[PDB]
Amino acid sequence: SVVISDAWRQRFGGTARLYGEKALQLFADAHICVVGIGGVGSWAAEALARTGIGAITLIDMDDVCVTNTNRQIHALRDNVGLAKAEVMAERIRQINPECRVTVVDDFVTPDNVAQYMSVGYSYVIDAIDSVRPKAALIAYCRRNKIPLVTTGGAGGQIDPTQIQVTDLAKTIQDPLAAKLRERLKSDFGVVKNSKGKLGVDCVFSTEALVYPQSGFGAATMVTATFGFVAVSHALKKMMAKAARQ
Amino acid sequence: SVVISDAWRQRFGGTARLYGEKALQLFADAHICVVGIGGVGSWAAEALARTGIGAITLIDMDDVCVTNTNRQIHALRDNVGLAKAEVMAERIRQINPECRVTVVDDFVTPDNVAQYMSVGYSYVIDAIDSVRPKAALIAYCRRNKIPLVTTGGAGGQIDPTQIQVTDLAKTIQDPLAAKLRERLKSDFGVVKNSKGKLGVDCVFSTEALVYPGFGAATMVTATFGFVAVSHALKKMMAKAARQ
Ligand SMILES: Nc1ncnc2c1ncn2[C@@H]1O[C@H](COP(=O)(O)O)[C@@H](O)[C@H]1O
Ligand SMILES: Nc1ncnc2c1ncn2[C@@H]1O[C@H](COP(=O)(O)O)[C@@H](O)[C@H]1O
């Protein structure tokens, strides 16, 4: 068990009062991986750190670009050109200097997924946009019963009150999730069971897509909320599993 | 009237692709006030900045405290003891150096609300927690037809998906909103109309409250702020539309 220090309780006393003391230790002992530190994942990383999660792995090899500014928490003038994962790690150490943060400066691929998932995470939050690796990550977590939550496309959306969680097989107005389902079947033989489910939790929105005005655009209000609903769903699952034990 | 630089178009290309060029220009010309830079308002200030809003005022007098860490974007070790509004202003300038950020290092009170509120804001986001000033700010904006969105209670809640916007008269499960309508009536004679509405937009959640000083979580308090900002932008855009 990670030891909760007096400074930890000052930082996260509001966490303890919301979720209880048992959950505070559960979160301090957790190890959560965020794959893709972008429009969804950067805000997922922020939320985990601010809810007293004791260890966080960040996996991404992209750098902060000026064009990230609309929707990524790490996109500031002074960060531009630095590695997203490294920049987010430094911000997490500012939120909670006792959080153990690991940076994997790499992309997940069908060939390295086993080694990066081999670590035994409490939860994986998949926030990547490229469909091939996303399918491979999902296929691997599902087969190995690794707790995972994924996200459909967060672009082309303006209403954060329509964001919610469903089985991946049952999303709508999400072309990314549809391509994902195709690739899961075609490359990994992962298909719907009899009850019509893939057994994979997906954050999506019922909102009708807003097509490019002036690729799809995006807004913090929506993309960040994707990440926050992914974190809330993961924490809730973790707590349910602990109580069940 | 703000001339959108190319640097601005590089920052907010994605904004333009989502809301359109006309909206982008409307946001660059807007001036939005955020009152209370806490678990709700700090994320609202952030969303405002990252959506290309061209002028932002922040009103708060409190300092960043370690206990803020669970739910406020400016709560970081090196910021502790600095004025929240100034820390947030500095961050906004790092998001968009061309943004015009004004810090009011004061609390809104029933005696200074007209002086601060009547600067001609495009929109006011009220994210204050104290009931009496909050009633006063709502009553003033509503009497003066200042576009306002207010936020109810964000603490004691774990489910960001239950957050919504409705007329302040129709909120449920929110004691802060209930106390506000009471105070509005008693101290300002602000009361429901014919249609049952008070004519005030309120961000609230239908979730039943979790009693341990409620706790709070970023995933919820931030989403209150994000939903306030999306609502304000929708209303401004709809008003622009209808020329
Ligand atoms: N295979 C991958 N592994 C890890 N991160 C990825 C991978 N593919 C894409 N990403 C990242 O996922 C993030 C997607 O965010 P966005 O551009 O905001 O949708 C970006 O930061 C990408 O660099
Ligand atoms: N009358 C007021 N005028 C402006 N800001 C206020 C007022 N009362 C409270 N606040 C701020 O509202 C914020 C509430 O945040 P929280 O404590 O997270 O609800 C804090 O940063 C307070 O300092």
Coordinates of C-alpha atoms and ligand atoms in Angstrom, one line a residue:
Chain A
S1 CA 0.0 0.0 0.0
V2 CA 1.1 3.5 -0.9
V3 CA 1.4 5.5 2.3
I4 CA -1.0 8.5 2.4
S5 CA 1.1 11.5 3.8
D6 CA -0.3 14.5 5.6
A7 CA 0.3 16.6 2.4
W8 CA -1.7 14.0 0.4
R9 CA -4.7 14.4 2.6
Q10 CA -4.5 18.1 2.3
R11 CA -4.5 17.8 -1.5
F12 CA -7.2 15.1 -1.7
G13 CA -9.4 15.7 1.5
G14 CA -12.2 16.6 -0.9
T15 CA -11.7 13.3 -2.7
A16 CA -12.0 11.4 0.6
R17 CA -15.1 13.3 1.5
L18 CA -16.7 12.4 -1.9
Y19 CA -15.7 8.8 -2.4
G20 CA -14.8 7.8 1.2
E21 CA -11.5 6.9 2.9
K22 CA -11.4 3.4 1.6
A23 CA -11.6 4.7 -2.0
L24 CA -8.8 7.3 -1.2
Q25 CA -6.4 4.4 -0.4
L26 CA -7.7 2.4 -3.4
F27 CA -6.9 5.4 -5.7
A28 CA -3.5 6.0 -4.0
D29 CA -2.7 2.3 -4.7
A30 CA -3.9 2.4 -8.3
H31 CA -1.8 2.3 -11.4
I32 CA -3.6 3.8 -14.5
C33 CA -2.3 4.0 -18.0
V34 CA -3.4 6.7 -20.4
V35 CA -2.6 6.0 -24.1
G36 CA -2.7 9.1 -26.2
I37 CA -2.2 12.4 -24.4
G38 CA -4.3 14.5 -26.8
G39 CA -7.7 16.1 -26.9
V40 CA -9.3 13.4 -24.6
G41 CA -6.3 11.9 -23.0
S42 CA -4.6 15.0 -21.7
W43 CA -7.7 15.9 -19.7
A44 CA -8.1 12.2 -18.5
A45 CA -4.5 12.5 -17.2
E46 CA -5.3 15.8 -15.3
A47 CA -8.5 14.2 -13.8
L48 CA -6.6 11.1 -12.6
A49 CA -3.9 13.2 -10.9
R50 CA -6.5 15.5 -9.3
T51 CA -8.4 12.5 -7.9
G52 CA -5.4 11.1 -6.0
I53 CA -4.4 8.3 -8.3
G54 CA -1.0 7.2 -7.1
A55 CA 0.7 6.0 -10.3
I56 CA 0.1 7.0 -13.9
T57 CA 1.7 5.9 -17.1
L58 CA 1.4 8.2 -20.1
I59 CA 2.1 6.7 -23.5
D60 CA 2.4 9.0 -26.6
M61 CA 5.4 10.1 -28.9
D62 CA 3.8 13.2 -30.4
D63 CA 4.9 16.7 -29.5
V64 CA 2.8 19.7 -28.5
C65 CA 1.8 21.7 -31.6
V66 CA 0.2 25.2 -31.7
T67 CA -2.8 23.7 -33.4
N68 CA -3.5 21.6 -30.2
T69 CA -4.4 24.7 -28.4
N70 CA -8.1 24.4 -29.0
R71 CA -8.5 21.2 -27.0
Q72 CA -5.3 20.0 -25.1
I73 CA -4.4 21.0 -21.5
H74 CA -0.7 21.0 -22.2
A75 CA -0.9 23.3 -25.2
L76 CA 0.7 26.5 -24.0
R77 CA 3.2 28.9 -25.9
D78 CA 6.1 27.6 -23.7
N79 CA 5.4 23.9 -24.4
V80 CA 5.1 24.0 -28.1
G81 CA 7.6 21.6 -29.6
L82 CA 8.1 19.5 -26.5
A83 CA 6.9 15.9 -26.0
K84 CA 3.3 15.8 -24.9
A85 CA 3.8 12.9 -22.5
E86 CA 6.8 14.5 -20.9
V87 CA 5.1 17.9 -20.6
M88 CA 2.0 16.2 -18.9
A89 CA 4.2 14.3 -16.6
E90 CA 5.8 17.5 -15.3
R91 CA 2.3 19.0 -14.8
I92 CA 1.2 15.9 -12.8
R93 CA 4.3 16.2 -10.6
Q94 CA 3.1 19.7 -9.9
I95 CA -0.4 18.6 -9.0
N96 CA 0.8 15.8 -6.8
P97 CA 4.6 15.5 -6.3
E98 CA 4.1 12.1 -4.6
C99 CA 2.4 10.6 -7.7
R100 CA 4.6 8.1 -9.5
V101 CA 4.5 9.1 -13.1
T102 CA 5.9 6.9 -15.9
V103 CA 6.5 8.3 -19.5
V104 CA 6.6 5.9 -22.4
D105 CA 7.8 8.1 -25.2
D106 CA 6.5 5.7 -27.9
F107 CA 3.3 4.8 -29.8
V108 CA 1.5 1.6 -29.0
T109 CA 1.6 -0.7 -32.1
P110 CA 0.4 -4.3 -32.7
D111 CA 4.0 -5.3 -32.0
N112 CA 4.7 -3.6 -28.6
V113 CA 1.3 -3.8 -27.0
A114 CA 2.0 -6.9 -25.0
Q115 CA 5.1 -5.4 -23.5
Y116 CA 3.5 -2.1 -22.6
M117 CA 0.3 -3.7 -21.2
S118 CA 2.4 -6.4 -19.4
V119 CA 2.7 -4.1 -16.4
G120 CA -0.5 -5.0 -14.5
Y121 CA -2.5 -1.7 -14.6
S122 CA -5.6 -1.1 -12.5
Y123 CA -7.1 0.4 -15.6
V124 CA -6.3 1.5 -19.1
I125 CA -7.8 4.6 -20.7
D126 CA -7.4 4.4 -24.5
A127 CA -7.6 7.9 -26.0
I128 CA -5.8 7.3 -29.3
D129 CA -7.1 8.4 -32.7
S130 CA -5.5 5.9 -35.1
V131 CA -7.7 3.0 -35.8
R132 CA -5.2 0.2 -36.4
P133 CA -3.3 0.5 -33.1
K134 CA -6.5 1.3 -31.3
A135 CA -8.0 -2.0 -32.5
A136 CA -4.8 -3.8 -31.4
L137 CA -4.9 -2.2 -27.9
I138 CA -8.6 -3.0 -27.5
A139 CA -8.2 -6.6 -28.7
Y140 CA -5.3 -7.1 -26.4
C141 CA -6.9 -5.7 -23.2
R142 CA -10.1 -7.6 -23.9
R143 CA -8.4 -11.0 -24.4
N144 CA -6.3 -10.5 -21.4
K145 CA -9.1 -9.2 -19.2
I146 CA -7.3 -5.9 -18.6
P147 CA -9.8 -3.2 -17.4
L148 CA -10.1 -0.7 -20.2
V149 CA -12.3 2.1 -21.3
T150 CA -12.1 3.6 -24.8
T151 CA -13.5 6.6 -26.6
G152 CA -15.1 7.2 -29.9
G153 CA -14.4 10.4 -31.9
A154 CA -14.6 13.5 -29.8
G155 CA -14.4 15.8 -32.8
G156 CA -17.3 17.4 -34.7
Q157 CA -19.2 17.8 -31.5
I158 CA -20.4 20.8 -29.5
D159 CA -22.7 19.5 -26.7
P160 CA -21.0 17.9 -23.7
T161 CA -24.4 16.9 -22.0
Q162 CA -24.8 14.1 -24.6
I163 CA -21.6 12.2 -23.7
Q164 CA -22.2 8.8 -22.0
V165 CA -20.8 5.2 -21.9
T166 CA -22.1 2.1 -23.8
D167 CA -20.8 -1.1 -25.3
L168 CA -18.6 -0.4 -28.2
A169 CA -21.0 -2.4 -30.4
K170 CA -23.7 0.1 -29.8
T171 CA -22.4 3.6 -30.5
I172 CA -24.0 6.0 -33.0
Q173 CA -22.8 9.1 -34.9
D174 CA -19.2 8.0 -34.5
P175 CA -17.4 7.1 -37.6
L176 CA -14.2 6.3 -35.6
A177 CA -16.0 3.7 -33.5
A178 CA -17.5 2.1 -36.7
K179 CA -14.1 1.8 -38.3
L180 CA -12.8 0.3 -35.1
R181 CA -15.5 -2.3 -35.1
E182 CA -14.6 -3.2 -38.7
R183 CA -10.9 -3.5 -37.9
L184 CA -11.5 -5.5 -34.7
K185 CA -13.4 -8.1 -36.7
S186 CA -11.2 -8.1 -39.7
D187 CA -7.8 -8.1 -37.9
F188 CA -8.5 -9.8 -34.6
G189 CA -11.7 -11.8 -35.1
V190 CA -13.4 -9.8 -32.4
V191 CA -17.1 -9.8 -33.1
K192 CA -20.4 -9.2 -31.3
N193 CA -21.6 -11.9 -29.0
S194 CA -25.2 -13.2 -29.0
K195 CA -26.4 -10.3 -26.9
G196 CA -25.0 -7.9 -29.5
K197 CA -22.0 -6.7 -27.4
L198 CA -18.3 -6.6 -27.8
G199 CA -17.6 -6.5 -24.1
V200 CA -15.7 -3.2 -24.5
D201 CA -16.8 0.0 -22.6
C202 CA -16.8 3.0 -24.9
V203 CA -17.4 6.7 -24.2
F204 CA -19.5 8.3 -27.0
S205 CA -22.1 10.9 -27.7
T206 CA -25.6 10.8 -29.1
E207 CA -25.0 14.2 -30.7
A208 CA -25.3 14.5 -34.4
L209 CA -21.9 15.3 -36.0
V210 CA -21.1 18.8 -37.0
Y211 CA -19.2 18.5 -40.3
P212 CA -16.1 20.7 -41.1
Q213 CA -17.0 24.4 -41.5
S214 CA -14.9 27.2 -43.1
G215 CA -11.2 17.3 -41.0
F216 CA -13.6 17.7 -38.1
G217 CA -13.1 20.5 -35.6
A218 CA -13.1 20.1 -31.8
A219 CA -13.7 22.0 -28.6
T220 CA -12.2 21.6 -25.1
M221 CA -15.7 21.5 -23.6
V222 CA -16.5 18.3 -25.4
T223 CA -13.1 16.5 -25.8
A224 CA -12.2 17.1 -22.1
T225 CA -15.5 15.8 -21.0
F226 CA -14.9 12.6 -22.9
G227 CA -11.8 12.2 -20.9
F228 CA -13.6 13.1 -17.6
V229 CA -16.4 10.6 -18.3
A230 CA -13.8 7.9 -19.1
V231 CA -12.1 8.5 -15.7
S232 CA -15.3 8.6 -13.7
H233 CA -16.4 5.3 -15.3
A234 CA -13.1 3.7 -14.6
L235 CA -13.1 4.8 -10.9
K236 CA -16.6 3.6 -10.5
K237 CA -15.7 0.2 -11.9
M238 CA -12.7 -0.1 -9.7
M239 CA -14.7 0.7 -6.6
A240 CA -17.4 -1.8 -7.6
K241 CA -14.8 -4.5 -8.0
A242 CA -13.3 -3.7 -4.6
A243 CA -16.6 -3.8 -2.8
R244 CA -17.5 -7.1 -4.5
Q245 CA -14.3 -8.5 -3.1
Chain B
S1 CA -13.5 44.3 -35.3
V2 CA -10.5 42.3 -33.8
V3 CA -8.2 41.4 -36.7
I4 CA -7.6 37.7 -36.5
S5 CA -3.9 37.2 -36.9
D6 CA -2.4 34.2 -38.6
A7 CA -1.0 33.0 -35.3
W8 CA -4.6 33.1 -34.0
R9 CA -5.8 31.0 -36.9
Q10 CA -3.0 28.5 -36.2
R11 CA -4.3 28.3 -32.6
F12 CA -7.9 28.1 -33.3
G13 CA -8.1 26.3 -36.7
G14 CA -10.1 23.5 -35.0
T15 CA -12.5 26.1 -33.5
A16 CA -13.2 27.5 -36.9
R17 CA -13.7 24.0 -38.3
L18 CA -16.3 23.3 -35.6
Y19 CA -18.3 26.5 -35.3
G20 CA -17.4 28.3 -38.6
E21 CA -15.6 31.5 -39.6
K22 CA -18.4 33.8 -38.6
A23 CA -18.4 32.2 -35.1
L24 CA -14.7 32.4 -34.8
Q25 CA -14.9 36.2 -35.5
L26 CA -17.8 36.5 -33.0
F27 CA -15.7 34.8 -30.3
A28 CA -12.7 37.0 -31.1
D29 CA -14.9 40.1 -30.6
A30 CA -16.5 38.9 -27.5
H31 CA -15.9 39.9 -23.9
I32 CA -16.8 37.3 -21.3
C33 CA -16.8 37.7 -17.5
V34 CA -16.1 34.7 -15.2
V35 CA -17.1 35.3 -11.6
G36 CA -15.4 33.0 -9.1
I37 CA -12.3 31.1 -10.3
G38 CA -12.8 27.9 -8.4
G39 CA -13.8 24.3 -9.1
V40 CA -16.3 25.4 -11.7
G41 CA -15.0 28.8 -12.9
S42 CA -11.4 28.0 -13.4
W43 CA -12.2 25.3 -16.1
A44 CA -14.7 27.8 -17.6
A45 CA -11.9 30.4 -18.0
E46 CA -9.8 27.7 -19.6
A47 CA -12.5 26.6 -22.0
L48 CA -13.1 30.3 -23.0
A49 CA -9.4 30.8 -23.7
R50 CA -9.1 27.6 -25.8
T51 CA -12.2 28.5 -27.8
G52 CA -10.7 31.8 -29.1
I53 CA -12.7 34.2 -26.9
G54 CA -10.9 37.5 -27.4
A55 CA -11.4 39.3 -24.1
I56 CA -11.8 37.6 -20.7
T57 CA -12.5 39.2 -17.3
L58 CA -11.9 37.1 -14.1
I59 CA -13.3 38.2 -10.8
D60 CA -12.0 36.6 -7.5
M61 CA -10.0 37.6 -4.5
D62 CA -9.0 34.3 -3.1
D63 CA -5.6 32.6 -3.2
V64 CA -4.6 29.2 -4.5
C65 CA -4.7 26.7 -1.6
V66 CA -3.4 23.1 -1.4
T67 CA -7.0 22.0 -0.7
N68 CA -8.0 23.3 -4.1
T69 CA -5.9 20.5 -5.8
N70 CA -8.8 18.1 -6.2
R71 CA -10.8 20.4 -8.5
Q72 CA -9.1 23.5 -9.7
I73 CA -6.9 23.9 -12.8
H74 CA -4.6 26.6 -11.3
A75 CA -3.9 24.4 -8.1
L76 CA -0.3 23.4 -8.6
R77 CA 2.6 23.4 -6.1
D78 CA 4.3 26.5 -7.5
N79 CA 1.1 28.5 -7.5
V80 CA 0.1 28.0 -3.9
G81 CA -0.5 31.3 -2.1
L82 CA -0.9 33.4 -5.4
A83 CA -4.1 35.1 -6.3
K84 CA -6.2 32.6 -8.3
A85 CA -7.4 35.2 -10.8
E86 CA -3.8 36.3 -11.6
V87 CA -2.5 32.7 -11.9
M88 CA -5.4 32.0 -14.3
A89 CA -4.7 35.2 -16.2
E90 CA -1.1 34.2 -16.7
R91 CA -2.2 30.8 -17.9
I92 CA -4.7 32.4 -20.4
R93 CA -1.9 34.5 -21.8
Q94 CA 0.1 31.3 -22.3
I95 CA -2.9 29.7 -24.2
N96 CA -3.5 32.8 -26.3
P97 CA -1.1 35.7 -26.1
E98 CA -3.4 37.9 -28.0
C99 CA -6.3 37.4 -25.6
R100 CA -7.2 40.5 -23.6
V101 CA -7.3 39.4 -20.0
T102 CA -8.5 41.6 -17.2
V103 CA -8.2 40.6 -13.5
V104 CA -10.5 42.1 -10.9
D105 CA -9.0 41.3 -7.5
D106 CA -12.2 41.7 -5.6
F107 CA -15.4 39.9 -4.5
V108 CA -18.7 40.7 -6.1
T109 CA -21.1 42.1 -3.4
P110 CA -24.6 43.4 -3.5
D111 CA -23.1 46.9 -3.2
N112 CA -20.5 46.7 -6.1
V113 CA -22.4 44.5 -8.5
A114 CA -23.7 47.3 -10.8
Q115 CA -20.2 48.8 -11.1
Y116 CA -18.6 45.5 -12.2
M117 CA -21.4 44.0 -14.2
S118 CA -22.2 46.9 -16.4
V119 CA -19.0 47.0 -18.4
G120 CA -20.8 45.6 -21.4
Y121 CA -19.9 41.9 -21.3
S122 CA -21.0 39.6 -24.1
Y123 CA -21.8 37.0 -21.4
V124 CA -21.3 36.5 -17.7
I125 CA -20.5 33.0 -16.2
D126 CA -21.4 33.0 -12.5
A127 CA -19.4 30.3 -10.7
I128 CA -19.5 31.8 -7.1
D129 CA -20.4 29.5 -4.2
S130 CA -21.8 32.1 -1.6
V131 CA -25.5 32.5 -1.8
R132 CA -26.1 36.2 -1.0
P133 CA -23.7 37.8 -3.6
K134 CA -24.8 35.1 -6.1
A135 CA -28.5 36.1 -5.7
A136 CA -27.5 39.7 -6.1
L137 CA -25.5 39.0 -9.3
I138 CA -28.3 36.9 -10.7
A139 CA -31.0 39.6 -9.9
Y140 CA -28.8 42.4 -11.4
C141 CA -28.0 40.6 -14.7
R142 CA -31.5 39.4 -15.1
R143 CA -33.0 43.0 -14.5
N144 CA -30.5 44.5 -16.8
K145 CA -30.8 41.7 -19.5
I146 CA -27.1 40.9 -19.2
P147 CA -26.7 37.4 -20.7
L148 CA -25.8 35.2 -17.8
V149 CA -25.4 31.6 -17.0
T150 CA -25.3 30.4 -13.5
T151 CA -24.1 27.3 -11.9
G152 CA -25.7 25.4 -9.0
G153 CA -24.0 23.0 -6.6
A154 CA -21.2 20.9 -8.1
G155 CA -19.9 19.3 -4.9
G156 CA -21.1 16.0 -3.5
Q157 CA -21.5 14.5 -7.0
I158 CA -19.7 11.8 -8.9
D159 CA -21.5 11.6 -12.3
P160 CA -20.6 14.1 -14.9
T161 CA -23.2 12.7 -17.4
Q162 CA -26.2 14.0 -15.3
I163 CA -25.2 17.7 -15.7
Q164 CA -27.6 19.8 -17.7
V165 CA -29.0 23.3 -18.2
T166 CA -32.5 24.5 -17.5
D167 CA -34.4 27.5 -16.1
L168 CA -33.4 28.1 -12.4
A169 CA -37.0 27.5 -11.5
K170 CA -36.9 24.0 -12.8
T171 CA -33.8 22.5 -11.1
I172 CA -34.1 19.4 -8.9
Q173 CA -31.8 17.8 -6.5
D174 CA -29.8 21.0 -5.9
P175 CA -30.0 22.7 -2.5
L176 CA -27.9 25.7 -3.7
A177 CA -30.3 26.4 -6.5
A178 CA -33.2 26.1 -4.1
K179 CA -31.7 28.5 -1.7
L180 CA -31.1 30.9 -4.6
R181 CA -34.7 31.0 -5.7
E182 CA -35.7 31.6 -2.1
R183 CA -33.2 34.4 -1.7
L184 CA -34.1 35.9 -5.1
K185 CA -37.8 36.1 -4.0
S186 CA -37.3 37.4 -0.6
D187 CA -34.5 40.0 -1.3
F188 CA -35.2 41.0 -4.9
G189 CA -38.8 40.1 -5.5
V190 CA -37.6 37.9 -8.4
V191 CA -40.2 35.3 -8.8
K192 CA -41.5 32.9 -11.5
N193 CA -43.3 34.1 -14.4
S194 CA -46.4 32.8 -16.1
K195 CA -44.6 30.0 -17.8
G196 CA -43.1 28.9 -14.5
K197 CA -39.6 30.2 -15.3
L198 CA -37.4 32.8 -13.7
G199 CA -35.7 33.6 -16.9
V200 CA -32.3 32.5 -15.6
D201 CA -30.2 29.7 -17.2
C202 CA -28.7 27.3 -14.6
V203 CA -26.2 24.5 -14.9
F204 CA -27.2 21.8 -12.4
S205 CA -27.1 18.1 -12.0
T206 CA -30.0 15.7 -11.4
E207 CA -27.7 13.5 -9.3
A208 CA -28.7 12.9 -5.6
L209 CA -26.1 14.3 -3.3
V210 CA -23.3 12.3 -1.6
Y211 CA -22.9 13.5 2.1
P212 CA -19.5 12.9 3.7
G213 CA -18.3 20.3 3.3
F214 CA -19.2 18.2 0.5
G215 CA -16.3 16.6 -1.3
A216 CA -15.9 17.2 -5.0
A217 CA -14.2 15.9 -8.2
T218 CA -12.6 17.6 -11.2
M219 CA -14.6 15.4 -13.6
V220 CA -17.8 16.9 -12.2
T221 CA -16.9 20.5 -11.3
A222 CA -15.0 21.1 -14.5
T223 CA -17.8 19.7 -16.6
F224 CA -20.2 22.2 -14.9
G225 CA -17.9 25.0 -16.2
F226 CA -17.6 23.4 -19.6
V227 CA -21.3 23.0 -20.0
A228 CA -21.8 26.7 -18.9
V229 CA -19.4 27.8 -21.6
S230 CA -21.0 25.7 -24.3
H231 CA -24.4 27.0 -23.4
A232 CA -23.2 30.6 -23.5
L233 CA -21.6 30.1 -26.9
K234 CA -24.7 28.5 -28.3
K235 CA -26.9 31.4 -27.1
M236 CA -24.4 34.0 -28.5
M237 CA -24.3 32.1 -31.8
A238 CA -28.1 31.9 -32.0
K239 CA -28.4 35.6 -31.3
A240 CA -25.8 36.4 -34.0
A241 CA -27.7 34.2 -36.4
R242 CA -30.9 36.1 -35.9
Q243 CA -28.9 39.1 -36.7
Ligands
LIG1 N1 -0.5 4.3 -31.3 C1 -0.5 5.3 -30.5 N2 -0.1 5.2 -29.2 C2 -0.1 6.2 -28.4 N3 -0.6 7.5 -28.7 C3 -1.1 7.6 -29.9 C4 -1.1 6.6 -30.9 N4 -1.7 7.0 -32.0 C5 -2.0 8.3 -31.8 N5 -1.6 8.6 -30.5 C6 -1.9 9.9 -29.9 O1 -3.3 10.0 -29.5 C7 -3.6 11.4 -29.3 C8 -4.9 11.7 -30.1 O2 -5.4 13.0 -29.7 P1 -6.1 14.0 -30.7 O3 -5.2 14.5 -31.8 O4 -6.5 15.2 -29.8 O5 -7.3 13.1 -31.0 C9 -2.4 12.2 -30.0 O6 -1.6 12.9 -29.0 C10 -1.6 11.1 -30.7 O7 -0.1 11.5 -30.8
LIG2 N1 -18.7 37.2 -4.0 C1 -17.7 36.6 -4.8 N2 -17.2 37.3 -5.9 C2 -16.3 36.6 -6.7 N3 -15.8 35.4 -6.4 C3 -16.3 34.7 -5.3 C4 -17.3 35.3 -4.5 N4 -17.5 34.4 -3.5 C5 -16.8 33.3 -3.8 N5 -16.0 33.5 -4.8 C6 -15.0 32.6 -5.4 O1 -15.8 31.5 -6.0 C7 -14.9 30.4 -6.1 C8 -15.7 29.2 -5.6 O2 -15.0 28.0 -5.9 P1 -15.3 26.7 -5.2 O3 -14.7 27.0 -3.8 O4 -14.5 25.6 -5.9 O5 -16.7 26.7 -5.2 C9 -13.7 30.6 -5.1 O6 -12.5 30.8 -5.8 C10 -14.1 31.9 -4.4 O7 -13.0 32.7 -4.0

